Amino acid sequence: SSIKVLKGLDAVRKRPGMYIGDTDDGTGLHHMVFEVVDNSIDEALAGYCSEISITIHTDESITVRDNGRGIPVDIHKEEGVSAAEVIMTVLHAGGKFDDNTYKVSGGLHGVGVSVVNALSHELRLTIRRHNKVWEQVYHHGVPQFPLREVGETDGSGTEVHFKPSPETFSNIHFSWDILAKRIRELSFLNSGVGILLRDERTGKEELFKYEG
Numbered sequence: 001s002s003i004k005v006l007k008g009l010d011a012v013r014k015r016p017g018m019y020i021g022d023t024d025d026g027t028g029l030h031h032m033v034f035e036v037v038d039n040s041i042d043e044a045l046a047g048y049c050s051e052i053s054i055t056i057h058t059d060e061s062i063t064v065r066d067n068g069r070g071i072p073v074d075i076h077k078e079e080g081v082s083a084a085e086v087i088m089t090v091l092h093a094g095g096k097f098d099d100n101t102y103k104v105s106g107g108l109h110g111v112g113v114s115v116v117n118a119l120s121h122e123l124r125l126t127i128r129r130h131n132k133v134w135e136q137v138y139h140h141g142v143p144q145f146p147l148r149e150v151g152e153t154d155g156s157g158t159e160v161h162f163k164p165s166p167e168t169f170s171n172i173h174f175s176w177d178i179l180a181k182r183i184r185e186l187s188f189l190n191s192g193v194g195i196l197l198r199d200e201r202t203g204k205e206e207l208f209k210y211e212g
């Protein structure tokens with residue numbers, strides 16, 4: 001089972017353009033952010049998330065944080081690992097790739113966040129759920145340790161800090177303009193959700209919240 005999962009992540013790293021799009025022209029790089037944000041938006045659509053933040057760090061890493069339920073943490077009998085680890089490591093975890101419905105939400109969201117994990121040289125997942133803080137670190141999608149309880153919290157939600165792999169992507173430089181344009185659109189499409197974009201490289205920040 002563990003070998004099968006590692007092979008799946010290796011397949012993403014072998015042919016990244018088939019999962020994320022062009023790895024040189026910035027389209028795949030920005031898709032990495034948009035896939036993580038789309039998971040937070042799904043939590044807003046479900047009725048649990050009102051706040052999403054996207055932070056661009058000085059090392060061109062990204063943090064996406066939401067105040068949703070937090071990815072479930074309970075250990076599966078079958079995989080022997082947290083539900084969260086399965087979500088972060090298995091393409092379309094728990095289900096099929098929907099060849100009928102990918103045209104609406106995109107193929108990338110159809111395979112899911114495990115692609116972002118596979119194509120990140122490092123990813124830190126922090127979950128706030130049931131008053132506990134859980135963390136898991138990955139490298140190229142491979143967990144460093146099982147999801148572990150690291151603290152207590154009054155908050156809930158999911159935080160993903162990822163560093164795109166320079167083995168996958170050339171010209172790893174995020175565009176404020178590309179991110180802001182899409183975030184403004186997501187705000188318009190998702191009334192009441194506050195989407196905060198912060199660029200620590202420049203000190204630029206902008207809250208997008210549509211009240212229509």
Ligand SMILES: CO[C@@H]1[C@@H](OC(N)=O)[C@@H](O)[C@H](Oc2ccc3c(O)c(NC(=O)c4ccc(O)c(CC=C(C)C)c4)c(=O)oc3c2C)OC1(C)C
Binds near residue numbers: 042069084087
């Ligand atoms: C990347 O994870 C995404 C989530 O992303 C974010 N940012 O929250 C979100 O888009 C959505 O999150 C869901 C989707 C479904 C449930 C959901 O059905 C829940 N209900 C439960 O009672 C529950 C409790 C334990 C448990 O193991 C599961 C199934 C586990 C799943 C679906 C990962 C569900 C729940 O607590 O949280 C859920 C959450 C947080 O789907 C994921 C997990 C693929």
